[PDB]
């Protein structure tokens, strides 16, 4: 025996966790495609046939991943609005794409890039349709501008059937002051349907009052998973709470640190433990996690807050959730001591139809660094307390689970700021665990930039993968920043 | 001993997958599917604050003297930019009525000097107030015409339910259009909010064998008494009725005489000759209006109505406007007179069809436009010229309110403030003889091109806002970025 | 060990349970709830179903074919005229005029159209255009009735002229140009007239569009449909065209030096090859019509309801065809054929097999092989009468198409013995004495003049088909006749059998 | 611990075979049902809807009304003939005979029919019957087009004769008898000919029924529809009829000693009053036609697809009406009117208002009030020509109906000044000189003759209606004209304006 059931009961995990959920996923797509072929209708809000089957997947096998190269930039009419004054500040994009449609949002501040009193939030939704030269056009089918005195900040957006769910917090003071007060900022979820119904709810997740000093959405896309909307969150946890106590003495050091940090192992461990706690931000434990909301117009306390185990994950930061086939993935901003791209496979367990636990498996990487200040520049390799960095997510082009060891040879794409400490030199790239294998810098040396959001998808007609690279660029002319959706091909060379 | 622990650890995951993960997946697959099949113009309306503030003269003559430009206001630009360094967006057209707005521009992938192959972007939407009190141009639909047809020089106009765009199809360099005796393909595209699109080749009567070429003027058309009026211009062939009827006619604006010292005979002779171009195939260069009835089955119902050359300068690009019930025309100064040309247009109908047009100039010596050679911003004397740039203007007071038409008129727009170069974009308010308020955008040397200006009133706050759609030379993305600046015209 | 054995059994049993009855059950429940949501989305008392628009079983397999063997072709004669209720409308005043029929019949139905002039034939300004469609059904006497299922009357003040029509599935496609000045002025002026495609369905949808085929503007001074039927072929609608081409264009240059002399002229004209060749070359160029090259061709249109510039113009090579003229397209099985009106120096019936070559799904070239004949002349003026045999420039003639009763391709040499039928005006110079006939390459073997001598007539369109119930071939001869009582000119659908003897 | 392969193989097979097979099958069921909706909406694309069969808005409110006031009636004149594409089909051989039209127009649409005989105008064995239906729409010149939307040709060996037609919602009802022998023989035999009602709907449903109204058999030796239109009235279709009644029957008995002498006859006939009354009584009996009482009447049919004997025969009182003859029924607003052809001694137009009384939802009685007239004669033979004024037995005349332009009820004395229009053969004894006219009780006030002197003609059916859009009244005059070139006859729908000038 022994050897007989092992591979068989392993073939049942494959049968149940990859084979059947793929058949179901594929099933949903062919029926969707079948539905559109049956007063601007909501059935206008469906992507071209060419893309419905090429969204939220790993597009390349491990072998193909070796030969990937960036095509040249393609010109399309940007769906992202710019500022119309020099001091107008458009920042903090969030972008989500499903089989049917996409959602986009960003924050607008009228005068400069700091304002804890008033801002507005632009939202749009639309579809992808092919042009004449074959390449995609992001067709906006609706916009909204939430401008009503509620300072909605750090918003994450996700597609839902029929429209968008956006998750925001309401800013009334400087970020540091949120870490020091005991009560958290107000949390809101806004649902915006293509049929023009808009319902906004102030939400009260259990386990948040008197536990989390502050709580923010991660700014990167949420995802629609099993009838729930999952959003990335982070914040500050108060001392002496159960969550705090349950997280005590936990730390996570990524697989490739040991060979790169010459500091002694015991000191690495003590430094890594100390890295989840910020004296600057009110002596709170800085915590990443997921917020799970059921898709309902009647929301109050049904949303769940689920923290990641600090054994599995770095200090709390902005982030993004993804769906690749049937697995959920999490990008965590590197706001701590490890300056390399952080991607995890997230296992979610439901109990009584509800998410009750999450678990994170890192894709071990030493590639694509991020600028930071002080002792936590792109060159640091050693655990310690750091509170600095920048958002730069990454899209997985190959399946980390395709290798016998998880993520042994992983391939991903995104943008990054190629410098040690400054926010300059935005560079689009494709990378593996150890090396950048394809790269093109945008603009001249010293060109300023900030956050970068990357999303890829396949035209199943031309069998082509495109990636959109949404980058905040410093504008010399109009606006402090111009959020640009670069689009280009990821080609098998 | 130690395979039994992870054989039941695994067999509990198979319980989970079959009893939780998969049935939840099925519940959700059922859920999103039912939603998609559940999906099987009362919105597309401007806010109450603007519906009664559109297409009017906003100020009295007396008030006009105290108008000044307010600071630029920050709204989300509804005009899409390029996403490559060489990407080119050019030739905007913007139209706003009571219920909604329409917008369009031309997109060239490989730089602004490629004149074959392009795409045309279109959007429409409404205006709503923001918490700071100023307007937001809310886009409710976009379209990208990208089928390989080189649609060029497009004008757009709102219609009830949507937009009507007038384009021509360019298949050869401009100059060849004037030389060939067969005119280019003319198209009318109608795009409704309900996502119906109808596009048709039109052939107005009296075009074939009369007009060597014909273009929309790029400025907005207007919807007037059931018809859609677009500006047009082009080249008329020697020996036709239209050429003959137009023979010996010429127009010299009121204010030219005091500024030009040539003998009257020379001015007249030179003015007669400015309507004819040896460079463009010896055609008479001609301005007019295209009148289309609003229908979805257009072939030859659209009418071409030339202006008399006694009333109007050499044919050029232009724009139509509605102020109350009066139609006005802006005519680009592509000839010898470099100042802003605005006219009240009187349209006569015979048996339900526009049969004639007449133009009365608002006499002006203000807001020059850069041009080459002897036809720069400083020229004051009649001659043949084929140079200039588009720079429309919005009348803030009624030229009909004075005893003599246009004796004290006030208008606003952008212009490029140099003699010969297209640099230094400046938003201004002016009267007939002087600029009374002006704000340059960017630094000296900032390159720019066309500018479309449109004003409207917030009847909640009684503030007038103008949008100045300016074509700006860009260093970051694209060779050009078309920007809709917005600011108050303030009474002080 | 007992714990962690008995555990699996009852657990792996629940898995069998989950996978065999529990999960398939949720699948059945799922299927039912959305089949009962798909059906829940969706009138025959009010419907005239388009399978009315179906020819009778007696004709569906008898249309667009060669009906006789070469041997049977020698023994064909015309039967007596048969009386049906004409489907072609006449005038209601003495001065009304109907002219220029076009008629198309395929497997399922027929289409018909003609031009209506209110005040006499001489008025070429303003007219209206009558359109009809229907099917054929047998009568109790055994012969066809052309049953009209819809009429239309295009009457909006637009001067639609020279219209050709073709069936399409579900209806008709008509091709017209718009006339705004006399014919000769169309050749002189450098911009072509407006072209239109009108699609009319049995379901009452009508879309009419102006079209602009590539390579027309600044190349064709004018362009007309040839008035003969177009055909529906491989998803495209082909129409005969003609017009005048401007000097120094690619097309003019590409035709330079080309001419065509039919295979039987040599035995009939007694002039040295040098002059015959030079005169043939010249016959393609009309000084009277603005020094244009007068040119034949085919217009190819995709069947779609949003036409702008997809229609293509393909000229015939002048090495293969005579001077441009009115014409007609045919289908005999899978082969396209072209009849070309003899408006030039050769007065005999001109029929060709057309080879159409495609490229990327679009037609790109046409080749024409003549069926060499010397029979059925047509009346003309001056030196280009019925009796003329020599090359040279002429601009006179009349439309007189002909239907092929046997296959030109069945012989060793193409067209060495062809049999065709039509009508013709049996005089040399006048439009007089309409005569229905059957003829081979050299002789008229069966002929029946209609009316008294001096009876005035004009165009003739002939269409044949077979009753597969009785194995009888019927030909309909649509002839323009001078009228007295009502109208100045009338168009009549004569029908008779073509019988073997 | 060996049984964990018996289950493990059932786990795999369930998740790898059983479930993917089911998910695949389940997918097909959903797509079959989705394509089922794709197919159902594509059926609608194959339909011409009954909604097509509706007159343009300009005419809908302009139908079946008195158009002019009494005073406006004095200033009416005929406009020039207008030219439209005739909806009435002609013959395609010289001997083909089209005769006996019937035409019915209502709010929504019109119905037309006539008889076709293949060889000559005489036949009692075989003929066919053309039928059509359609609408009226305006042209650019402003005047109507009668647009055909469906045509039928009943050709099946049943010799349908003397057909009258009427519109019904969504189509037409036609009434014919079946002719198997000469007319005279019908009057001599006791059993009447076969009577048929055919209903023809736009949706293509056709139901023919042989009918047997009570009170016919052994009472009427023969019975024919009037040929003139019927009308659709309060759910019933009414048809004119006439025929020969048998001696000794209740109807004959109840009609004995009745007669009708029009109000304007005394002043015009010198004969002794006793000699007049005697002849008027005798004028209802034909010794030539099997010694029968020649009777006019009306047949009333419920609108049902399953008719047998629900149809009713209601004769007119011979005190109220002349000898039995062809005729026509009208709706002017809510009033039913009746034209009786003048086949007897009095050669002038006979119009009557008809009152129909209903007994429990069924017509039971009819009465006729004559519009007193001495205008519009009709040709006849011997002592009953257009000039004759004195009672006697005549059996001669021709069908020539009339449309009332003004309301005879709008004067104190019913029809003291009435205005009507039609055509008539303007000669004393012969069928020549067809003339369209407007007349009042005593004089013709407007008149245009058609064709040359001696133009032969026969029946004339006249129908007027109003373009409410332009406020013009138009009258269609359907006249059988002798033809030479093609056909014995050519039935023509002349149209002109009746202008208030
Ligand atoms: C999308 O919205 C359009 C309106 O905003 C709508 O167009 C309207 O469509 C009807 C029929 O197509 C037009 O109808 C006319 O009705 C008859 C037929 O000619 C005449 O009696 C009238 O005089 C008139 O001509 C309307 O004119 C047209 N409205 C406008 C403003 O153009 C489209 O039909 C809509 N598309 C869909 C999917 O329904
Ligand atoms: C809008 O759509 C959602 C589902 O997509 C539905 O639940 C909601 O009630 C809809 N609102 C309206 C007004 O249709
Ligand atoms: Ca706080
Ligand atoms: Ca040209
Ligand atoms: Ca021409
Ligand atoms: Ca009998």
Numbering used by the authors:
A (entry chain C): 64 to 101, 111 to 565
B (entry chain D): 62 to 101, 114 to 565
C (entry chain A): 61 to 102, 107 to 565
D (entry chain B): 65 to 565
Paper text:
Paramyxovirus fusion is typically mediated by two glycoproteins on the surface of virions: a trimeric fusion protein, F, with type I viral fusion protein characteristics, and a receptor binding protein variously named HN, H, or G depending on the virus and protein functionality. HN proteins have at least three functions: (1) they bind sialic acid receptors on glycoproteins and gangliosides at the cell surface (hemagglutinin activity). (2) HN proteins are neuraminidases, which catalyze the hydrolysis of glycosidic linkages on terminal sialic acid residues thus destroying the receptor. (3) A function common to paramyxovirus attachment proteins is to lower the activation barrier of the F protein, presumably through direct interaction, thereby triggering a major refolding event in F from a metastable prefusion form to a highly stable post-fusion form.
Here, we report the structure of the PIV5 HN ectodomain (residues 61–565), which adopts a hybrid state compared to the previously observed 4-heads-down and 4-heads-up conformations. Upon optimizing conditions, HN crystallized in the I4 space group and diffracted X-rays to ∼2.5 angstroms. Two disulfide-linked heads are in the up position, while two are in the down position (2-heads-up/2-heads-down), and the structure exhibits a novel non-covalent DOD interface between one head in the up position and one head in the down position (hereafter, the DOD interfaces observed in the 4-heads-up and 2-heads-up/2-heads-down conformations will be referred to as DOD1 and DOD2, respectively). A stalk/head interface is indeed observed in the current structure, which resembles that of NDV HN in that covalently-linked heads are in the down position allowing one head to form a similarly sized interface with the stalk (buried solvent-accessible surface area = 1,294 and 1,185 Å2 for PIV5 and NDV using similar methods, respectively). Like the stalk/head interface in NDV HN, the PIV5 HN interface is primarily hydrophobic with 28 hydrophobic interactions and 5 electrostatic interactions including two hydrogen bonds and two salt bridges. The stalk of chain B extends beyond the 4HB core, which ends at residue L101, forming an extended alpha helix through N110. This extended helix also corresponds to the positioning of the head of this chain higher than its covalent partner and is consistent with the 4-heads-up conformation, where one head of each covalent dimer extends higher than its partner leading to a ∼30° offset between covalent dimers across the DOD1 interface. A novel dimer-of-dimers interface lacking pseudo-tetrameric symmetry is observed between one head of one disulfide-linked dimer in the up position (chain A) and another (chain D) in the down position (DOD2). This ∼2-fold symmetric interface buries ∼1,139 Å2 (total) of solvent-accessible surface area and includes 16–17 residues from each of the two heads.
